[PDB]
Amino acid sequence: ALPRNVIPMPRSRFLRVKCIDCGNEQIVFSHPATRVRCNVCGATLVEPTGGKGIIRAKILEVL
Amino acid sequence: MKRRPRKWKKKGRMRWKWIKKRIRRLKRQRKKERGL
Amino acid sequence: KDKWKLKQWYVIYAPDFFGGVEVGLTPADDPEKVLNRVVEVTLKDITGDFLKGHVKLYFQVYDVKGQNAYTKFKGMKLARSYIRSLVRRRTTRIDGIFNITTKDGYKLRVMAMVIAARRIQTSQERAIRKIMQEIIYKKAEELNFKDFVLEAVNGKIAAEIAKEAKKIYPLKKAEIRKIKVLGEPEVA
Amino acid sequence: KKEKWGIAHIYSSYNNTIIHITDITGAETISRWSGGMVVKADRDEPSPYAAMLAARRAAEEALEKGIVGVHIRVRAPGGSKSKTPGPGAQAAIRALARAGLKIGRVEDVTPIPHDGTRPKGGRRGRRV
RNA sequence: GGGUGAAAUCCUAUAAUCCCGGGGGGACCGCCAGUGGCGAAGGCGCCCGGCUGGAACGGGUCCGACGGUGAGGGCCGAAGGCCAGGGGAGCGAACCGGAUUAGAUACCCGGGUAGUCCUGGCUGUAAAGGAUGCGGGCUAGGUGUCGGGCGAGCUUCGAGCUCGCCCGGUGCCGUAGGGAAGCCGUUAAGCCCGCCGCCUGGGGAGUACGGCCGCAAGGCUGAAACUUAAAGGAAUUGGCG
Numbered sequence: 001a002l003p004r005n006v007i008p009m010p011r012s013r014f015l016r017v018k019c020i021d022c023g024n025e026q027i028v029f030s031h032p033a034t035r036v037r038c039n040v041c042g043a044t045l046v047e048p049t050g051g052k053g054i055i056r057a058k059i060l061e062v063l
Numbered sequence: 064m065k066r067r068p069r070k071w072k073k074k075g076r077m078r079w080k081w082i083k084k085r086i087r088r089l090k091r092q093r094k095k096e097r098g099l
Numbered sequence: 100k101d102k103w104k105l106k107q108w109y110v111i112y113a114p115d116f117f118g119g120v121e122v123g124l125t126p127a128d129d130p131e132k133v134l135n136r137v138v139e140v141t142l143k144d145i146t147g148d149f150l151k152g153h154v155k156l157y158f159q160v161y162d163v164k165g166q167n168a169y170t171k172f173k174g175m176k177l178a179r180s181y182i183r184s185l186v187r188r189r190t191t192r193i194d195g196i197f198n199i200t201t202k203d204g205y206k207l208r209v210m211a212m213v214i215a216a217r218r219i220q221t222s223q224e225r226a227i228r229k230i231m232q233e234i235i236y237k238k239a240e241e242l243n244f245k246d247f248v249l250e251a252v253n254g255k256i257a258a259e260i261a262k263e264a265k266k267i268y269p270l271k272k273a274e275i276r277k278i279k280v281l282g283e284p285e286v287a
Numbered sequence: 288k289k290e291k292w293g294i295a296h297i298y299s300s301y302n303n304t305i306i307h308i309t310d311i312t313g314a315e316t317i318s319r320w321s322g323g324m325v326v327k328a329d330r331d332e333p334s335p336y337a338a339m340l341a342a343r344r345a346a347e348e349a350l351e352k353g354i355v356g357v358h359i360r361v362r363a364p365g366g367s368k369s370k371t372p373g374p375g376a377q378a379a380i381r382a383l384a385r386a387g388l389k390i391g392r393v394e395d396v397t398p399i400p401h402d403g404t405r406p407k408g409g410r411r412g413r414r415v
Numbered sequence: 416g417g418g419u420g421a422a423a424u425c426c427u428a429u430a431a432u433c434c435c436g437g438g439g440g441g442a443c444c445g446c447c448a449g450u451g452g453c454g455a456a457g458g459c460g461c462c463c464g465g466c467u468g469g470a471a472c473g474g475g476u477c478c479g480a481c482g483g484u485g486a487g488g489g490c491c492g493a494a495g496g497c498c499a500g501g502g503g504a505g506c507g508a509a510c511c512g513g514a515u516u517a518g519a520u521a522c523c524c525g526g527g528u529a530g531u532c533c534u535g536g537c538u539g540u541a542a543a544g545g546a547u548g549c550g551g552g553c554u555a556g557g558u559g560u561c562g563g564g565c566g567a568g569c570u571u572c573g574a575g576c577u578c579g580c581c582c583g584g585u586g587c588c589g590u591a592g593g594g595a596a597g598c599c600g601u602u603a604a605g606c607c608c609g610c611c612g613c614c615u616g617g618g619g620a621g622u623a624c625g626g627c628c629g630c631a632a633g634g635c636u637g638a639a640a641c642u643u644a645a646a647g648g649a650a651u652u653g654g655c656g
């Protein structure tokens with residue numbers, strides 16, 4: 001029912017990660033194309049690898 | 064030379080690689096021997 | 100003929116760092132003729148064990164002091180039927196050839212060989228060659244000629260390639276396959 | 288010591304066979320016999336029987352000069368020609384130890400190229 | 416010694432074939448190697464460093480129909496041949512001899528010039544073949560295998576091993592359907608929507624006459640008088656090697 005071939009839908013999410021050495025809360029992408037670093041302190045949050053990033057913080061939601 | 068692959072078939076004839084070489088010799092003689 | 104009644108037998112001697120031991124006899128007329136001959140003996144024949152009978156060693160004469168012909172190391176080679184049985188279909192042999200020099204000044208050319216346990220990609224295959232080069236040169240810095248050679252034929256260098264390289268792809272049988280010296284130290 | 292060894296170079300092709308006994312280095316030869324030095328006609332110069340006779344006459348001459356054993360090195364033309372030893376190789380090896388000599392280790396030393404030069408015939412072979 | 420179905424021409428006593436220690440010289444990169452990979456086709460296989468072209472996968476990135484095909488024009492194109500300079504080891508059109516034979520201008524044997532290799536140009540041809548022009552949509556399944564990603568399970572934690580799924584390449588057995596059959600069958604020779612090139616019984620003939628290119632050899636375009644009842648294709652039963 002309702003094949004994927006009609007109305008396609010993504011497979012990647014928006015997360016609500018939470019920093020480690022900053023406490024800050026953010027939103028990021030799951031398959032990023034750049035190096036997601038924090039918006040106050042500068043430590044990285046995700047890393048780009050091929051398909052799906054390999055995050056480096058604490059997740060609160062999947063949005 | 065614009066040849067046609069029906070003639071490489073060898074059934075009731077001689078080889079075509081050798082008919083070509085013999086047509087070329089006449090196209091030469093008609094040229095030198097006052098083909099002008 | 101009577102030309103054979105003018106001969107004389109000489110005793111050939113292995114190098115010093117293998118332990119001077121007799122390896123064959125040799126006939127000649129006058130000593131000046133037996134001066135660059137090359138003998139081939141296996142590793143099973145010096146410090147005899149029954150495992151390393153596929154390692155061959157070449158000794159080249161350099162001295163004749165009265166019925167005693169002392170030799171000098173010249174090369175090393177594994178036997179053809181041995182490395183012929185390691186290269187099976189579906190394995191991806193990897194081959195490296197390098198030029199080195201040791202502390203004394205002996206310049207050498209060594210030829211390693213690794214054999215993967217399964218077909219691998221060509222980018223995993225040059226990484227292993229990089230590993231080989233980087234632990235061969237490094238080994239050839241703090242070792243003199245007498246020690247680099249002594250552990251090439253033993254398997255002490257191969258048993259280290261086999262440890263570093265395995266963290267790219269699991270292998271079987273790393274070893275060194277041929278050595279040939281090129282020069283000597285110009286001095287001394 | 289008093290133990291003297293040597294090497295036997297055995298060259299075999301489809302048209303002849305040569306047995307050559309030299310000292311431990313190969314620099315002084317002791318006895319060299321062929322296939323056509325024994326039979327009389329050109330036909331079975333390569334046969335295993337001619338090899339049997341040549342190896343016998345070579346061992347006879349080398350045993351008295353002081354040889355006791357011999358290592359074995361078997362060879363084909365190789366190189367840019369055939370890569371397999373002919374019919375007389377094993378027949379010269381089996382009739383060399385029968386005539387009194389010992390035998391050490393055995394190996395084949397045919398030359399093999401790593402993509403070498405070009406052989407005869409030409410794109411069609413011998414159309415015999 | 417060499418070579419043969421069997422020999423002979425040839426090399427060798429000015430010491431060959433064979434074995435050992437050295438000096439030089441050109442061409443090619445074995446096994447691993449795989450209906451495996453890359454390229455528009457021709458084609459591309461030792462290893463290390465530098466510059467460069469294209470494609471697949473992942474993508475709530477950007478532009479906003481910018482597309483398909485393409486007469487006439489333009490670049491790329493194995494081998495061979497040509498014009499100038501270099502080089503020449505192995506192989507070898509022409510050529511010189513030994514044999515086989517009724518002849519042997521050939522197959523077989525011993526030599527050998529151009530060529531094959533490099534730098535600068537011209538030529539523009541192949542069974543250049545998947546004998547199958549290129550873009551889009553749709554119409555059962557099963558099973559190997561190469562590249563990316565995803566989800567599980569092991570692990571001597573390795574750029575590792577096994578299983579399942581999605582996308583793109585490369586193979587096989589096969590439904591509906593198509594075909595004269597051989598056989599094709601989501602990588603169509605099936606049902607549709609496009610554009611360009613070619614075909615019209617067999618020979619004469621890819622010839623004659625004219626034109627344009629090439630230094631030549633040659634390429635491209637290309638009829639008629641006449642003559643003939645068949646020429647072609649895919650499969651059956653035999654007879655035969």
Ligand SMILES: [Mg+2]
Pocket residue numbers: none
């Ligand atoms: Mg056109």
Ligand SMILES: [Mg+2]
Pocket residue numbers: none
């Ligand atoms: Mg010839």
Ligand SMILES: [Zn+2]
Pocket residue numbers: 019020021022023024038039040041042043
């Ligand atoms: Zn932070």
